[PDB]
Amino acid sequence: TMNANLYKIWLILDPRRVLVSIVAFQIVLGLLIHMIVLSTDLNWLDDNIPVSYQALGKK
Amino acid sequence: TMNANLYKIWLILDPRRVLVSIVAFQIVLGLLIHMIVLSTDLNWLDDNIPVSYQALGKK
Amino acid sequence: NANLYKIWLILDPRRVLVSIVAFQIVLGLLIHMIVLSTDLNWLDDNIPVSYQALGKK
Amino acid sequence: LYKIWLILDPRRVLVSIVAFQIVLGLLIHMIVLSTDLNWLDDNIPVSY
Amino acid sequence: FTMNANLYKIWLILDPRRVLVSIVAFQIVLGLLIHMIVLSTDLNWLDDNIPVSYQALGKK
Amino acid sequence: FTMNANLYKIWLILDPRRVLVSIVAFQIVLGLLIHMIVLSTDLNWLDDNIP
Amino acid sequence: TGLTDDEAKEFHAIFMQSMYAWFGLVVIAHLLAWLYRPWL
Amino acid sequence: TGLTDDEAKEFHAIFMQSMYAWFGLVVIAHLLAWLYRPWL
Amino acid sequence: TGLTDDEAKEFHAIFMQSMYAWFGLVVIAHLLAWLYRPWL
Amino acid sequence: TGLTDDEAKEFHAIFMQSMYAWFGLVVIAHLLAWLYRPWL
Amino acid sequence: TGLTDDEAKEFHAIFMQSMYAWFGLVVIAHLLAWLYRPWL
Amino acid sequence: AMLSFEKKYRVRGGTLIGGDLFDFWVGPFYVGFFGVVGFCFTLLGVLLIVWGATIGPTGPTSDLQTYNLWRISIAPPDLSYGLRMAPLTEGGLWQIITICAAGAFISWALREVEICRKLGIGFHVPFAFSFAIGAYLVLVFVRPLLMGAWGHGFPYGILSHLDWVSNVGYQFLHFHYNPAHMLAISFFFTNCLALSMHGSLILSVTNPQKGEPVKTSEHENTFFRDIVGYSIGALAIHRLGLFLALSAAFWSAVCILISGPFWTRGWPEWWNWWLELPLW
Amino acid sequence: SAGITHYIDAAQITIWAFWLFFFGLIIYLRREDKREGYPLDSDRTERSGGRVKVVGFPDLPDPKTFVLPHNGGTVVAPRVEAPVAVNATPFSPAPGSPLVPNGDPMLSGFGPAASPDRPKHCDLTFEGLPKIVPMRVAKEFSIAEGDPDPRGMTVVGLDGEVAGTVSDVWVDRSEPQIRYLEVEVAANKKKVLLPIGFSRFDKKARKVKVDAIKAAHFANVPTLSNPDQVTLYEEDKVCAYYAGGKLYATAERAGPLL
Amino acid sequence: PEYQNIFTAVQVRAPAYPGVPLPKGNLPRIGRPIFSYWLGKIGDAQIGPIYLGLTGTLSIFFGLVAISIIGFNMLASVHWDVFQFLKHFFWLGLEPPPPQYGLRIPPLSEGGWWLMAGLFLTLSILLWWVRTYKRAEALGMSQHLSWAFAAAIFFYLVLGFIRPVMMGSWAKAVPFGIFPHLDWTAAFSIRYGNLYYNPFHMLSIAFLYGSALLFAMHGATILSVSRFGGDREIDQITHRGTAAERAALFWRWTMGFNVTMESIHRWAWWCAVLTVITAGIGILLSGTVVDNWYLWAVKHGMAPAYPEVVTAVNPYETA
Ligand code: BCL
Ligand code: BCL
Ligand code: BCL
Ligand code: BCL
Ligand SMILES: CC[C@H]1c2cc3[nH]c4c(c3C)C(=O)[C@H](C(=O)OC)c4c3nc(cc4[nH]c(cc(n2)[C@@H]1C)c(C(C)=O)c4C)[C@@H](C)[C@@H]3CCC(=O)OC/C=C(\C)CCC[C@H](C)CCC[C@H](C)CCCC(C)C
Ligand SMILES: CC[C@H]1c2cc3[nH]c4c(c3C)C(=O)[C@H](C(=O)OC)c4c3nc(cc4[nH]c(cc(n2)[C@@H]1C)c(C(C)=O)c4C)[C@@H](C)[C@@H]3CCC(=O)OC/C=C(\C)CCC[C@H](C)CCC[C@H](C)CCCC(C)C
Ligand SMILES: CC(C)=CCC/C(C)=C/CC/C(C)=C/CC/C(C)=C/CC/C(C)=C/CC/C(C)=C/CC/C(C)=C/CC/C(C)=C/CC1=C(C)C(=O)c2ccccc2C1=O
Ligand SMILES: COC(C)(C)C/C=C/C(C)=C/C=C/C(C)=C/C=C/C(C)=C/C=C/C=C(C)/C=C/C=C(C)/C=C/C=C(C)/C=C/CC(C)(C)OC
Ligand SMILES: COC(C)(C)C/C=C/C(C)=C/C=C/C(C)=C/C=C/C(C)=C/C=C/C=C(C)/C=C/C=C(C)/C=C/C=C(C)/C=C/CC(C)(C)OC
Ligand SMILES: COC(C)(C)C/C=C/C(C)=C/C=C/C(C)=C/C=C/C(C)=C/C=C/C=C(C)/C=C/C=C(C)/C=C/C=C(C)/C=C/CC(C)(C)OC
Ligand SMILES: COC(C)(C)C/C=C/C(C)=C/C=C/C(C)=C/C=C/C(C)=C/C=C\C=C(C)\C=C\C=C(C)\C=C\C=C(C)\C=C\CC(C)(C)OC
Ligand SMILES: [Ca+2]
Ligand SMILES: [Ca+2]
Ligand SMILES: [Ca+2]
Ligand SMILES: [Ca+2]
Ligand SMILES: [Ca+2]
Ligand SMILES: [Ca+2]
Ligand SMILES: [Fe+3]
Fold first, then answer.
1. Fewest CB atoms within 10 Å of the CB: B31, D32, D41, L196?
2. How far apart are CA E22 and CA L77, in angstroms?
3. Do N37 and M247 contact (CB within 8 A), yes or no?
């Protein structure tokens, strides 16, 4: 609602200003998430399948 | 009823400082809250389901 | 692409272009590491880690 | 895309890859010679 | 050879004073580095088996 | 020798005083750095064989 | 300050509106969160 | 600021929708992510 | 900025296109991995 | 400072042909290593 | 920079003969090493 | 490149022990006769050390050998080889690095001087830096000598070098009572107070209250002339500072040069000469 | 921490926190660091670092508005500046090569003795009168009871030989500290402000040696417009001169020793 | 051989400047300012006068009270026999309440005076931060001291109200004597792992260093270019000059990047504040959070690993 009126914001906030400042979040938040998640839930990297190629493959 | 009266609050608060200010506080609390929620509230990520599957499949 | 050429008016081509040139290597060098690290190492974890530790003696 | 050197002076990114290579060459031989294999004593000759 | 054709032009960019010595620096740093790294693990030729392994003869 | 013939022109880019005294200090240490590294294990002539 | 009435009044609404969009967005969350992993 | 309601309206729109492109892009991720390995 | 929509799109062409040159060469990368050493 | 297709192109030619030059030195490098000692 | 096309040519040559100089010197000693005692 | 106004100071020469050769810049750094050398050691260290990171404890293979700053550390040789070059693998390498690092701070230190000259300024900077330099010698040299052991110094571990203190520190039980360590500590504190005042005050006068003039000393020289009553003065602060710090360092320097080669009992004891005074 | 992901707890979260806001505030400074002197001038070299951004990674901050004291214009930052002159010739065209001080360097106004053009308005005290003044108007002052009065001390060139003497020692209403000494030179019979900072006291022989410029150079010393007070512009002006002496007064100085 | 601004060689003096007058509320300044040639051979030789408002007195009073407690109880110790009080000075002190009354008001004896005295070095300390922000802006001055003061005053509370009282222990709160206090830090390191492993300390260190570093540089730098009015930063902040010209340039051709006669003073105020900040951090975590930071560390893959030339046995297991 008021999505029509919400356009005026640019008249108070620089586009470039809130522009790159978001482009950041994705990086800052992006690596941060994957990082936060790996240890906490489903450590997809070394946890489950496939079984170690190091020991299973060599040995 | 006070709704009609409330508009004038802008007359003392600069748009820049409080408009994005809140943008700053809202962002901080979400990071905090999602962060306090795990400790006692529920480590939804690795608490119950699904978890521990990786170890059962790792080897 | 059709209309997205407009963005090049808010972001400098050299600044955004080079800025990203640097971003991948850091995000790059950081990847094979985070992957190579604990994840399924490939360099010498298994084979041909044969000569690595055996060939020696 | 050859028209790309219009936004970058040669020197600026010409050397930004001259060193970047060296800051990787040593790194590469070092991470490899590190864990992968140690061509030095990892095979021949056998420890004295 | 192959890249020899137009490598004379590079000299406007790369100044002689600016990059002539810079190399002399890397080389010297590399030199020690290489002899150093080689000596640490591979064949510590210095005091390993030849020619007369004297240090062991006197110490013992 | 090989490079000797026209290498003479390089002195227009390498002032003597600076390249001369410079090499002096870098070489001297370069030697100690060697004996040092050499004298460490190779053969500590001091205490190694005789007398 | 640094504004007048017709702007304060007008903007006042625009912002205000959006503020609630959140009270909803966040509510669907607190409600859905409770819906899934309730609490208290 | 430093721009009339015109250019603003112009940027606002083109941008607004695009920001939806992600809400959509990332939503196909969370979505497909739930598929491979759900959680909660 | 510092250019009109004429050379802003021309560059955008080279930029955008080549930008895919990676999204593709990077997909062949991962895909080449998904076939050699898989993951999950 | 300044750059023009005339002078710009000239350099790209010499540069690009030097780029593969190294790349060719990298294919011969690892490939040859693939023969002496394998990896992975 | 600090030269023109001519001087650029003049130096590129004289030195180029010097760079290899080291190099050749390099291989003879890098080789002598390989021959006398093999690494690998 | 150059600063908005740098373009006008880059005179010619001014070098120390020669350097009118490489007397030029690169990026925003002046080279000279020291920017050159320091570099050498830098890589023949920053990377020479890499070799170490590679090698590790047992060998480059030992599960002990890792690549996590948190753990990676080059260990000095055993007290065995007293004042002698140890086997890189067993100690030397460590020495080697340390060998370099010495000059890398002796060069950059001097290089500072050449600069201080060019920019026709005062030299308080280097002279200061030296102390800091020294405290690094009398804590891996002046001491280990009067201990006959190079390997008797400390490591090069991101955090590993921490314990090295933990021990040598407890080697006297309550290291805390060391007369020096007390003062030397006190300084590293006082400094971190005055500093937290000057750098504060200023940033509170040049950028004062809303709709207010860039205040003048006529305030500063009273700001504390009110709270605390007296004001060391403005020129002064930039004195007390260097003082504190350039002392704190030199102090601590003493602090660990005497701990050992000049005192073997637990410090707590040293504090006895006090008690035993033929008075109380 | 270097490998990737291992342990998992609470406190370890926070360590990320601060050690994040740091990398944020770090930039804040970066910007605040750039105010003046920015942007850079030439292309003698590019920005050394990881990500060679156009001009500094932190987008230059905005203009800051410095509300000067009473009866004072207003200053801001950043604030574009008008290019200056370069009274010197590059010893070499090579980027990063030095610039020789054309003609007489002692005044060529370059590097060792260069300076900016600060406002030509004597910096005043709290209420109005100008801070730095000679002991003339500074009549309400008095030498530190004890310290040997410098009024009458004969200055002496770094060459040793005399070079005029002194007069009024420009005190200050802000802080009872001597900042300048009037030096009625010998050849010029004029007045050249002596920057105490450069004046070494020798209370033993009434002298005041200044190992900065030869006795003669006291003649080329930028002359004071008015003797009853000095403006910021010149406050930097007199100083910068002697400064040069540090690398000019003798062929020796400037050139390397070994 | 140039007068290196060490001690103001020749000095001079003018009447007692009782600072810029204050508005309607700031009571009269007080004191008949004095001069000391010596003190002055380093800085502003004038002494005073000083302000004294409400918190001014109110705070000072709440000050020389704890002292008159932590001071008294202490003397009592060596049975009011000063001679030894003088001897066992650096040893003496006043300990907190026994683990029993964890938070309860300790008896007039067992650690009581300490909780009493403590709270009076809890307010007066907090009240003096008021004797700042107050006398601070009433000078038309912004607030950056008042700020930091907190950061510091924060850490102080992380060594009391906020943590000691946070673990229910009128003991977990530092003693009250040079040595004993010198011991508390010692004791702490132990009771919980070994601080060298709690990042927020190994962190708060780098800062206590930086400050020990920077305010140590800029102190010199200024001096180096103090001839060129560097010391006058004030204006240099506004109207630049050869000072900030020569200075920053230095660091430019040294460590590369550099800043402004302004900026620096920033990092200054920062490193500093960002010190006690990280201080009270660890000290807050260490206690109600991780109990052994050494374990924490390694458990996170932090703590290093060396060979083993020595190891022991374990009675609790074989016996
Ligand atoms: C971990 C699982 C796999 C694996 C999976 C992958 C995958 C998946 C990918 C790679 C990719 C790469 N891998 Mg791999 N890789 C493995 C093991 C290795 C090992 C090893 C020793 O074992 C090594 C040394 C490498 C090395 C490399 C790099 C060659 C390459 C790029 C990385 C990057 O981030 O660039 C970041 C980029 C940049 C810094 C520069 C920007 C690129 C742009 C588009 C070009 C420049 C344009 C410019 C403006 C024009 C002017 C020209 C000049 C720049 C002046 N891999 C294992 C076996 N690897 C990537 C790749 O090869 O892409 C082709 C990739 O996508
Ligand atoms: C790891 C398994 C193998 C191995 C596999 C490989 C592989 C695979 C490669 C190398 C390559 C190299 N290896 Mg190896 N290598 C091994 C063991 C060694 C040992 C050893 C003691 O055991 C040594 C000393 C080396 C040393 C070297 C270098 C000679 C060489 C380049 C490295 C580099 O990236 O530089 C970084 C960067 C540079 C040198 C700069 C780029 C050069 C450009 C093209 C010229 C600049 C042009 C300029 C504009 C003009 C100015 C002219 C002058 C500067 C004035 N290897 C083991 C046995 N090695 C690389 C190689 O040989 O490439 C040809 C390579 O691809
Ligand atoms: C804690 C227990 C539950 C849970 C309960 C909740 C609850 C309850 C809520 C969330 C909410 C959110 N959760 Mg959660 N959440 C959980 C697990 C997760 C996980 C996870 C990996 O496990 C993730 C990644 C998230 C992530 C998220 C965010 C998408 C979302 C908003 C956070 C916020 O406060 O922003 C901070 C806010 C702001 C900065 C301001 C608002 C921004 C808006 C969109 C823009 C305004 C217009 C602007 C002026 C235009 C210019 C654009 C740019 C600003 C320049 N949650 C667990 C399972 N979560 C909230 C939500 O969904 O809101 C929709 C919410 O209320
Ligand atoms: C065992 C635990 C003991 C203890 C044991 C020790 C021991 C053991 C030692 C100290 C030392 C010191 N301790 Mg103690 N200490 C304890 C508790 C404390 C406490 C406390 C609050 O609890 C404090 C405040 C201190 C304070 C101090 C300092 C006074 C002192 C010197 C530090 C220093 O800065 O050297 C200054 C050092 C330098 C300037 C050198 C490094 C700089 C070099 C020149 C440049 C590096 C460049 C780099 C390589 C290049 C790359 C670029 C990068 C960007 C950097 N200790 C506990 C009780 N302490 C040390 C000392 O007294 O040294 C003299 C010492 O040896
Ligand atoms: C009281 C004095 C304080 C101080 C002052 C000080 N430091 C200074 C200066 C001054 C005045 C400079 O002028 C100089 C500077 O920044 O100049 C621009 C500097 C400096 N202070 C520095 C560091 C530093 N200072 C410290 C402390 C202090 N410096 C004191 C608090 C500390 C610590 C631990 O407390 C550190 C780490 C540098 C950033 C810089 C000097 C840079 C320099 O000369 O570097 C030369 C070498 C290289 C860049 C490459 C390194 C290659 C080597 C071969 C490896 C060395 C390995 C090392 C010994 C092991 C480290 C591992 C540890 C984790 C165990
Ligand atoms: C990183 C932050 C650093 C820091 C910052 C900091 N300190 C600060 C501030 C700031 C920003 C202030 O604003 C404040 C200050 O000085 O304000 C003017 C202060 C301060 N830092 C102080 C001390 C201090 N700071 C320390 C440390 C630090 N402070 C950190 C390093 C330390 C340590 C442990 O190293 C100490 C000891 C004080 C000087 C001052 C706070 C003073 C205060 O709150 O006083 C309250 C009032 C009293 C104590 C009453 C005094 C009673 C009488 C006036 C004296 C009579 C004599 C006395 C009782 C002796 C006994 C004699 C008997 C016989 C009677
Ligand atoms: C896998 C992998 C990535 C491997 C790595 C392989 C690599 C990279 C190998 C290369 C290794 C090499 C060669 C590294 C060296 C590279 C170089 C040259 C790095 C720079 C070295 C260096 C000393 C950097 C600075 C170090 C830092 C940041 C120290 C911090 C201390 C600190 C807070 C300093 C403050 C700095 C500032 C702001 C100075 C400015 C400043 C100050 C201090 C004033 O006092 C002053 C007074 C009056 C007016 C102005 C000023 C003023 O501007
Ligand atoms: C013509 O143009 C005009 C002039 C009209 C201007 C145009 C303007 C426009 C277009 C404006 C647009 C505005 C917009 C889009 C505004 C959006 C606003 C938003 C998203 C506002 C959000 C507000 C959020 C608020 C107010 C949150 C309040 C939160 C509170 C009070 C939180 C309290 C939290 C506590 C106590 C937390 C404690 C932490 C725990 C629980 C952990 O303690 C235990
Ligand atoms: C008259 O005209 C005049 C003469 C003035 C101008 C003339 C100019 C001339 C003649 C110019 C000549 C230029 C030349 C000869 C240029 C040569 C250029 C070369 C050889 C360029 C080489 C470029 C190489 C590039 C761009 C390499 C890019 C490499 C990348 C992106 C590597 C990424 C590597 C990664 C991410 C490695 C990761 C390692 C792991 C996986 C271990 O990290 C975890
Ligand atoms: C007015 O004046 C008039 C015109 C009358 C002229 C009068 C002039 C006069 C009176 C001049 C007098 C001149 C004098 C007395 C000159 C004396 C000159 C001396 C004593 C020169 C000595 C130069 C000594 C040299 C060149 C030493 C070289 C040493 C070397 C290369 C040492 C190498 C050491 C190594 C490699 C050590 C390695 C140690 C280990 C093995 C441990 O490293 C691992
Ligand atoms: C007999 O004495 C005469 C007359 C001769 C005068 C001489 C006095 C002298 C010489 C006094 C000397 C005193 C000295 C040397 C004191 C030294 C003190 C030191 C070194 C202290 C070091 C650290 C102190 C700390 C960390 C104190 C922390 C205190 C805290 C956190 C207090 C907190 C209080 C709170 C939170 C109170 C809350 C109120 C209640 C308890 C009701 O909340 C439940
Ligand atoms: Ca998985
Ligand atoms: Ca769950
Ligand atoms: Ca493998
Ligand atoms: Ca091998
Ligand atoms: Ca509940
Ligand atoms: Ca106790
Ligand atoms: Fe300052």
1. B31
2. 34
3. no
> Of the bound ligands, which one is closest to the alpha carbon of residue N61?
6
What CATH number has the domain spanning J1-40? 1.20.5.250
Resolution of the solved structure (Å)? 3.0
Nearest residue by C-alpha to atom 28 in ligand 7: N255
CATH topology for A1-59 is: Light-harvesting Protein (4.10.220)
Give CA angle at L14 (L11, L20), nearest 5°. 90
Neighbouring CB atoms inside 10 A of L59's CB total: 14
Fold of D1-48: Light-harvesting Protein (4.10.220)
CATH 4.10.540.10 fits M1-117, yes or no: yes
What is chain B's length?
59
- What are the structural domain ranges in chain G? 1-40
Helix (H) or strand (E) run with residue M75 in it: strand M74-77
**L5, N242 contact by CB (below 8 A):** no
Instruction: Output the DSSP codes for chain L.
Output: ---TTGGGT--S---BSB-SSS--EETTEE-TTTHHHHHHHHHHHHTHHHHHHHH-SS-SSSTT----TTT-EEPPPPSSS-SSPPPTTTSHHHHHHHHHHHHHHHHHHHHHHHHHHHTT---HHHHHHHHHHHHHHTTTTHHHHTTT-STTS--EETTHHHHHHHHHHHTTS-GGG-HHHHHHHHHHHHHHHHHHHHHHHHTTTTS-STT-----HHHHHHHHHHTTS----HHHHHHHHHHHHHHHHHHHHHHHHTTBTTB-S-HHHHTHHHHTSTT-
Superfamily of domain E1-60: Light-harvesting complex (4.10.220.20)
Three-class HEC string of chain N: CCCCCCCCCCEEECCCCCCCCCCCCCCCCECCCEECCCHHHCCCCEECCECCCHHHHHHHHHHHHHHHHHCHHHHHHCCCCHHHHHHCCCCCCCCCCCHHHCCCCCCCCCCHHHHHHHHCCCHHHHHHCHHHHHHHHCCCCCCCHHHHHHHHHHHHHCCCCCCHHHCCCCCCCCCCCHHHHHHHHHHHHHHCCCHHHCHHHHHHHHHHHHHHHCCCCHHHHHHHCCCCCHHHHHHHHCCCCCHHHHHHHHHHCCCCCCCCCCHHHHHHHHHHHHHHHHHHHHHHHHHHCCCCHHHHHHHCCCCCCCCCCCCCCCHHHHC
**What CATH architecture applies to the domain C1-57?**
Irregular (4.10)
Q: Ligand 6 centre from N149 Cα, in Å?
A: 10
Method of elucidation? X-ray
Task: Sketch the domain layout of chain D as residue ranges.
Answer: 1-48
Task: Give, as residue ranges, everything with CB less than 5 Å from ion ligand 13.
Answer: B 44, 47-48; H 40
Q: Which of M153, G8, C37, F6 lies closest to K17 in space, CA to CA?
A: F6
Q: What is the 3-state secondary structure (H, E, C) of I7-40?
A: HHHHHHHHHHHHHHHHHHHCHHHHHHHHHCCCCC
Cis-peptide, bond into residue I38, ω within 30° of zero = no
Buried b (16+ CB within 10 A) or exposed e, F3-16: beeeeeebeeebee
- H or E element in which residue K33 lies: helix K5-36
The residue type of H20 is Y
CA D18 vs. chain centroid, Å, equals 10
On whether G39 is known to bind a ligand per the annotation, the reply is: yes
Pairing of strands M207-209, M155-156: parallel
Helix (H) or strand (E) holding M194: strand M192-195
Domain F1-51 class?
few secondary structures
Length of chain K: 40
Put simply, the chain A residues between 1 and 59 with a CB less than 8 A from any chain B CB are 12-13, 37, 40-43, 46-49, 51-52
Mark out chain M residues that contact chain C at CB-CB < 8 A. 3-6, 50-54
